[model samples]
Target: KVFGRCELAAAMKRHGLDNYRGYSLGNWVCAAKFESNFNTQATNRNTDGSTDYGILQINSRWWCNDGRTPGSRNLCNIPCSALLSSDITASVNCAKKIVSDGNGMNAWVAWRNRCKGTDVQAWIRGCRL
Candidate 1:
């Protein structure tokens, strides 16, 4: 499903990403905007032959399996398509697990390249939450 910026921010707030794993809500939203533009079904096949899945763009190489991809670690024990759902529960839970694994927000290169050290508050501007 497609979400407007405000809608996405509200959902993210309800998901409690404010201080999750040392990352802020702005950080998550900023990274997600670049990674998927809030598109739940977004997918991008990387140069390494692995695909990035869903809004968070979780990588298939270590997170989920796409069936066609070989040697997935499946650390989340979920199908890559599962991460593409409009309901972000599975994705959120998996993301938390990923951060717990020590990757932090660094797991998403968008966070590293675009969101980090920037004025990420713009991602949630006027959301009032």
Candidate 2:
């Protein structure tokens, strides 16, 4: 399954937040769920408590504060800066590679499932595919 830029962006835009807007709300929320469970600016506490990380729970040591590669797409502009970008193709493709080589479209399917709910997989399974 090959996804175009818009399609990928549509799947990872994070547009449901009242203050934020995009097309990948579902994906964003789902990623957050998997990463931080629905908290916009969530953070965690370390034993030392010197300094910790927040939402997505990514500590400051990893990627040097890059928030665009874990699976997010609506935050950063740099390729390795975000969990994933609107480039659904890159996001989904990369996700597929990480979990299943697109076998089950794990990440893409997860985003769809989160975005559209249980049937998201079915929704993105066929049409225009």
Candidate 3:
């Protein structure tokens, strides 16, 4: 499902993404905004046989197991399909586990390229909560 900007932002907020790991709610919103356009089923297939799944764009090589990517770690111990659902529970939970690991927000190249260190308040402008 394609989520509206505010809807996606609020969902992430409720999932404890706001200020988690020292990143703002807007930063997390910017993460999904640029990564998948807030599209739950978005996937990017890589030349290395790895795939990025869902709004968080989690990787099959290190996070979710797609039963396709070779040498997958499945660190989240979840099927990649779970990330494609609109409910976002599995997706957001995986995202939290991912960023909390090592590289933090730098895990998503989109955030580094577009949202990092930028004024991301535009990502959650009208949402007062």
lDDT of candidates 1 onward, in order? 0.87, 0.34, 0.91
Q: Rank order by TM-score, top first?
A: 3, 1, 2
Q: How accurate is candidate 1 locally (lDDT)?
A: 0.87
**Ordering by lDDT:** 3, 1, 2
lDDT of 3 by residue, 12-79 (tens): 88888989898899998898989999999999998899999999899999988898987779889999
In candidate 1, position 8 carries an lDDT of: 82
1 or 3, which is superior by lDDT? 3
TM-score of each: 0.93, 0.28, 0.96
Count backbone overlaps in model 2: 20
Please list the residue runs of candidate 1 whose C-alpha ends up more than 4 Å from where it truly belongs after superposition. Answer: none
- The best candidate by TM-score is 3
Candidate 3 clashes: the total is 0
